[PDB]
Ligand binder design. Structure first.
Ligand SMILES: *[C@@H]1O[C@H](CO)[C@@H](O[C@@H]2O[C@H](CO)[C@@H](O[C@@H]3O[C@H](CO[C@H]4O[C@H](CO)[C@@H](O)[C@H](O)[C@@H]4O)[C@@H](O)[C@H](O[C@H]4O[C@H](CO)[C@@H](O)[C@H](O)[C@@H]4O)[C@@H]3O)[C@H](O)[C@H]2NC(C)=O)[C@H](O)[C@H]1NC(C)=O
Ligand SMILES: CC(C)(C)CC(C)(C)c1ccc(OCCOCCOCCOCCOCCOCCOCCOCCOCCOCCO)cc1
Ligand SMILES: *[C@@H]1O[C@H](CO)[C@@H](O[C@@H]2O[C@H](CO)[C@@H](O)[C@H](O)[C@H]2NC(C)=O)[C@H](O)[C@H]1NC(C)=O
Ligand SMILES: *[C@@H]1O[C@H](CO)[C@@H](O[C@@H]2O[C@H](CO)[C@@H](O)[C@H](O)[C@H]2NC(C)=O)[C@H](O)[C@H]1NC(C)=O
Ligand SMILES: *[C@@H]1O[C@H](CO)[C@@H](O[C@@H]2O[C@H](CO)[C@@H](O)[C@H](O)[C@H]2NC(C)=O)[C@H](O)[C@H]1NC(C)=O
Ligand SMILES: *[C@@H]1O[C@H](CO)[C@@H](O)[C@H](O)[C@H]1NC(C)=O
Lengths: 352, 342
């Protein structure tokens, strides 16, 4: 197989340092000090201006065979777990089609644009022992999700690069809903806590209490956050978890905010989503026992583009839970417009 | 944003080599480094106010608190360094009381009383257990880090008296992280490392001291569905309630050599010894040292149903084996065994 060549790997005899820890120097801006050593270094990659990591199959040829096998067994298509996976399919389809074509296989890979959240599917690709394979796109009768594969691939090893690293995907030996743990980084230091990977950045901090402070989701996925990489996962009420478990929300008490419950009806279908606790520009939020109950997350702008100024909440805490998306700024479920006149507002239709 | 301004102002910024990711990367985030194996000399405790602390003590002394037990060596060394300053203050406020701090050899044990912010004439810190000043009348875990220093004083840590009552460890000095095939539970004296080989399991631990506080759940990984019998480092000895704190074939080392000072746990053979699986072997017992009091070597060891490599302790007085690992020869040569039972 000529699409892959390795370099140095882990098992190489390193006399200088621990090969499976991160080794370097960093400035601790709190204490204002420079420290070198070995350990675990967690970086923010969700908010990077370009992609450091890129998926590629370990063997394109092998992957083409996995697909034609799946095609024979009734698997009409596939749904990606993440934007990065989607970009791999988008980037490798012409290569796959060539493999299939030159081997006289009546099958072509079709990958459609994915705008919303990356949803789950029941089927799985497996290793070896209509004439199209559709990746993502809208939900159709021609290729329903229930016949599509999802979360069938995981990272085997990484590829060196100068301004970007390759991640090579292999076929999973098992069936899980769990996110690939190889790309997960979780850490807590100086009472600041991070649950992260290549698309989620979830930050909780101890102010007067431990609570969620900020979250950035480059996409909204449907895999499961592993317990191995989860902080504070004892005595959990899934109702209190701000980011829903079914949306790769960490089953962690860090994933909470007093006054708030599970945002099952947040704007998850908006693409990139950023959660934090501040006021939407030009709006206000006041406590009122005479306020509406939890409902779909509402955007602070109308379909026309008019601004809803006055907002209320029954029993939440301030500052309000705020979403920021491409289409504007939204408020958490427990926060409702104060005026009952619906001006044809924009609300989430997700319910997850 | 607000919380994004805070992160840049309070996070770690630098570069590191990741052989796992096969990359060299710079950036901002959170860095957990190894400090137990060198840095206990560079970070140092200071009380926020000696003066305020002297008042805190004389109050507690009046309320029947005869003395104190430190949570950690770092705390112990603070007392040792600040006693002359406190005693001077006490003298100057006409208070018939002096602080006495004794050497601490064993594990740092717990105590029920607490100092608060708002008939001997001595306040005893640590030392052996006495009837003159019993543990049950001493305070413990009354302090926490208020804040850190800066630039030149970046390695200074200023302590305040706890506003609340817990058994939990000071969380401000805790670093817990997992990335690639590595998961770390650490602070200024514990380094607890688990690795993903075929499965996630404990691989190595270094304890510069053995303390008796409780590892916070907020800084605990994989703390769901815990069987405490399976936790290698005992919960009562600041062991993390984590499934990372496990090793297939082994149960809680309640009778390990915790009273020896520095302890290093890992899974390798003691030099000159061997370990074999045998159903005709002894059941779990106190951890045994591979050398006798005389200085003779035990070579042959057995275990009933554990996994190899064996659980190994390393202390100043030598190398020991896990509770489930017993000498194969039944002739007792007067062995050196742990007497802790925790
Ligand atoms: C880290 O965590 C700390 C504490 O957990 C936070 O500190 C608090 O921040 C809030 C937000 O500003 C403060 O609340 C404000 O208090 C002002 C004064 O308090 C009134 O009420 C008290 C009763 O306790 C009286 O004693 C006092 O005399 C005042 O009458 C108010 O003026 C503020 O009101 C504003 O917002 C309300 C919201 O409805 C409006 O109705 C008002 O018109 C006005 O616009 C607000 O209530 C609180 O005082 C702070 N406490 C402390 C101890 O500092 C930090 O904010 C937090 N930091 C981060 C980054 O998260
Ligand atoms: O150290 C200072 C870092 O300065 C910050 C600049 O950005 C750092 C991000 O990393 C990119 C570095 O760019 C150069 C690539 O470095 C990798 C080592 O280069 C050796 C490659 O030689 C050929 C490989 O075969
Ligand atoms: C792999 O596991 C998943 C989850 O355990 C299975 O998903 C279920 O599949 C059935 C129909 O196939 C659906 O009705 C359920 O709703 C699914 N549960 C979910 C999505 O949580 C899946 O069937 C398994 N597939 C294989 C090939 O093992
Ligand atoms: C009051 O406290 C002092 C200091 O702790 C006690 O003096 C020591 O007591 C121990 C107890 O066995 C002796 O071993 C030491 O030799 C004593 N001196 C020193 C310098 O440590 C004293 O006994 C206490 N008096 C009481 C309880 O009545
Ligand atoms: C990771 O686990 C594997 C077993 O799953 C270890 O492999 C064994 O290594 C020992 C000595 O290194 C050999 O005697 C065995 O034959 C190996 N077994 C197999 C199945 O290969 C491996 O050593 C572990 N890695 C580390 C770093 O401890
Ligand atoms: C400290 O708190 C614990 C928590 O239950 C309690 O049992 C104990 O009595 C308290 N001690 C003091 C001195 O307040």
């Amino acid at each position: 197989h000529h699409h892959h060549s390795s370099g140095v790997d882990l098992g190489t005899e390193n006399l200088y340092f621990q090969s499976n820890a991160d080794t370097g120097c960093a400035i601790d801006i709190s204490r204002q000090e420079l420290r070198c050593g070995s350990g675990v270094f967690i970086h923010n990659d969700v908010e990077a201006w370009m992609d450091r990591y890129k998926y590629y199959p370990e063997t394109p040829q092998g992957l083409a065979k996995i697909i034609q096998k799946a095609h024979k067994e009734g698997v009409c298509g596939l749904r990606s777990v993440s934007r990065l996976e989607h970009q791999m399919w988008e980037a490798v389809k012409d290569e796959l089609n060539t493999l299939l074509k030159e081997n006289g296989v009546d099958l072509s890979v079709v990958v459609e644009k994915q705008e919303g959240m990356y949803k789950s599917a029941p089927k799985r690709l497996t290793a070896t022992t209509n004439n199209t394979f559709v990746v993502d796109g809208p939900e159709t009768k021609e290729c329903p999700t229930q016949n599509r594969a999802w979360n069938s691939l995981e990272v085997e090893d990484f590829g060196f690069g100068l301004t970007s690293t390759r991640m090579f995907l292999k076929v999973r030996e098992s069936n899980t809903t769990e996110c690939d743990s190889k790309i997960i980084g979780t850490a807590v230091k100086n009472n600041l806590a991070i649950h992260s990977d290549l698309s989620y950045w979830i930050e909780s901090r101890l102010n007067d209490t431990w609570k969620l402070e900020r979250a950035v989701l480059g996409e909204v996925k449907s895999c499961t956050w592993p317990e191995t990489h989860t902080l504070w996962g004892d005595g959990i009420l899934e109702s209190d978890l701000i980011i829903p478990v079914t949306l790769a929300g960490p089953r962690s008490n860090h994933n909470r905010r007093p006054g708030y419950k599970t945002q099952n009806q947040g704007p998850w279908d908006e693409g990139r989503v950023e959660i934090d606790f501040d006021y939407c520009p030009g709006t206000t939020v006041t406590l009122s026992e005479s306020c509406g109950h939890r409902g779909p997350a509402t955007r602070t702008t109308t379909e026309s583009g008019k601004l809803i100024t006055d907002w209320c909440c029954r029993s939440c805490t301030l500052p309000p839970l705020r979403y920021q998306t491409d289409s504007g700024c939204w408020y958490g479920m427990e926060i409702r417009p104060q005026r009952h006149d619906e001006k044809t507002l924009v609300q989430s239709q997700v319910n997850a």
